[PDB]
């Protein structure tokens, strides 16, 4: 049908939902208006009914509309400057002299530059080829800044297919220590190794084991980072497949895997550490079924760990309760991220300290 | 399909960096400027139409000497669905097999009867698991070197 008419009707239904007591109908109810909004928004933005529900019921109406506008709009581009080779103002000056529009990414990160436009392919600049910056995202900036690693430790990156997180951790540790970067598939591991050698990291070991196995292969790492593979409900613009390729079986199977990987990270961490016993769990989805029901499974099955403050600058605080599921009061510290509020892909970050 | 694309393009368009890398021809010219002595027939341009994908890519030494011109590069194909009898212009994802030459398959040469991976997002094909298809096989059934267009039939 006329999607222009449907989006106008979406706006009208949002207004009616917002002022139902004043602006109403003869007998049409809250459920009827919400379900009409469901069909309209599914038909317009092209979502499966199940996922469109989870998202509309997770968000307030105007916030949901802005959220889907954000999911449909692409993000501005952003790079991480490698402190291993150069620093922010020098790289910025080089690119400005070369013809690239750069600005500081913000006051929240001292290692990032936001890129607006250029007349040169940013994937071909000599400093890029030499490893002065990496094409990354702020949502992947966040997890390492949650798990700030200090010099001379043993760290475990559970899934490092792109390589940005491992390179950021190595840059923070100043090419000291040992970083085990496991990545289940070989094809992504090739690009990972290329990225590491381009950025110049000498304290990394690339593996290819099922991450649900690291307490058997080594165990006892000082710091653990787990970017759990999830549905990707926050990377909708990058991967439009998620709009309809996530069904009930997926939202049932994906959590189970996240649950087991988080248990494995808990087991592999070391409680008796002179510098850190910390685990940072991140996922690229915005669905309670996968982001916070899993942290609970950790605090309800392993009493040897405790939630600790992430120290990340901004955001809107985490969900302490949902539909019938009440969580440990401790979840509040977990901070969630969304694209409409901040032009940052919607991800979750939780931070763990082991005691036993 | 066309109204869906039109409304997406009309509304959801915001500035974002997109610049194409310099092409293989001037890259080859620069390599020649770097190397004085030109071996006889060191260049051979690929005359059959090709599909590449990424704007800029450094090819391995093995295939760094095949030149694919931009005027011959293609990126979309007219794909026909038989059961839902309709032809749609769809993007080309990748070249899977060219049953004339393995080298042609590797380089992306686009000939007759050629299996390619085509994006079937706009059709809305529902799978057995109820799922939505995003890529399928299509046999190119014409001769793009003679007809300045690519025509394929979906294998469904």
């Amino acid at each position: 049908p006329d999607l222009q008419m449907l989006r106008t009707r979406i706006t009208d239904t949002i207004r009616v939902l917002e002022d139902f007591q004043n602006l109403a109908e003869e007998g049409r109810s809250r459920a009827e208006y919400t379900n009409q909004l469901l069909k309209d928004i599914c038909a317009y933005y092209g979502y499966n009914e199940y996922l469109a529900e989870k998202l509309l019921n997770l968000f307030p109406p105007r916030e949901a509309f802005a959220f889907f506008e954000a999911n449909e709009t692409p993000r501005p581009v952003v790079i991480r400057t490698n402190t291993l080779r150069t620093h922010r103002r020098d790289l910025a000056q080089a690119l400005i002299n070369r013809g690239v529009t750069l600005e500081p990414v913000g006051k929240w990160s001292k290692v990032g530059l936001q890129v607006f436009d250029s007349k040169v392919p940013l994937g071909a600049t000599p400093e890029y080829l030499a490893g002065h910056y990496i094409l990354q995202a702020a949502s992947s900036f966040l997890p390492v800044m949650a798990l700030c690693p200090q010099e001379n430790e043993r760290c475990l990156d559970m899934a490092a297919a792109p390589g940005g997180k491992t390179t950021h951790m190595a840059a923070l540790m100043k090419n000291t220590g040992v970083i085990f970067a496991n990545d289940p598939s070989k094809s992504r591991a090739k690009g990972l190794i290329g990225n590491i050698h381009r950025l110049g990291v000498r304290n990394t070991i690339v593996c290819n084991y099922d991450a649900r196995e690291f307490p058997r292969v080594i165990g006892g790492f000082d710091r653990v980072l787990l970017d759990a593979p999830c549905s990707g409900t926050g990377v909708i613009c990058k991967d439009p497949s998620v709009k309809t390729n996530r069904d009930a079986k997926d939202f049932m199977q994906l959590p189970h895997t996240q649950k087991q990987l988080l248990l494995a990270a808990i087991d592999s961490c070391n409680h008796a550490s002179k510098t850190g016993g910390y685990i940072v769990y991140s996922t690229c989805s915005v669905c309670v079924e996968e982001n916070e029901e899993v942290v609970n499974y950790a605090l309800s099955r392993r009493p040897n760990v405790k939630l600790v403050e992430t120290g990340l600058p901004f955001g809107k605080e985490g969900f302490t309760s949902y539909m019938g599921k009440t969580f440990h009061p401790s979840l509040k510290l977990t901070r969630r991220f969304y694209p409409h509020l901040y032009n940052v892909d919607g991800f979750f970050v939780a931070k763990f300290k082991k005691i036993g | 399909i066309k109204n869906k694309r039109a409304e997406k393009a009309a509304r959801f368009s915001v500035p974002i960096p997109k610049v194409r890398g310099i092409s293989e021809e001037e890259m080859f010219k620069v390599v020649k400027t770097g190397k004085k002595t030109h071996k006889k027939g060191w260049k051979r341009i690929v005359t059959k139409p090709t599909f590449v994908g990424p704007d800029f890519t450094r090819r391995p030494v093995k295939y760094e000497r095949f030149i694919r011109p931009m005027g011959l590069r293609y990126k979309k194909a007219n794909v026909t669905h038989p059961t839902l009898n309709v032809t749609v212009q769809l993007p080309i994802l990748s070249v899977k097999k060219n049953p004339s030459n393995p080298l042609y398959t590797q380089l992306g040469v686009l000939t007759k009867g050629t299996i390619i991976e085509v994006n079937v997002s706009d059709l809305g094909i529902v799978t057995a698991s109820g799922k939505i298809a995003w890529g399928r096989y299509a046999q190119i059934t014409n001769n793009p070197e003679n007809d300045g267009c690519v025509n394929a039939v979906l294998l469904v």
Binding site: E103, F116, P313 | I16
Partner: peptide, 14 residues
Amino acid sequence: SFADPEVYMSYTPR
């Protein structure tokens, strides 16, 4: 409107 004015990396140059 529904965004934090403090940290919202925009699209146009500043």
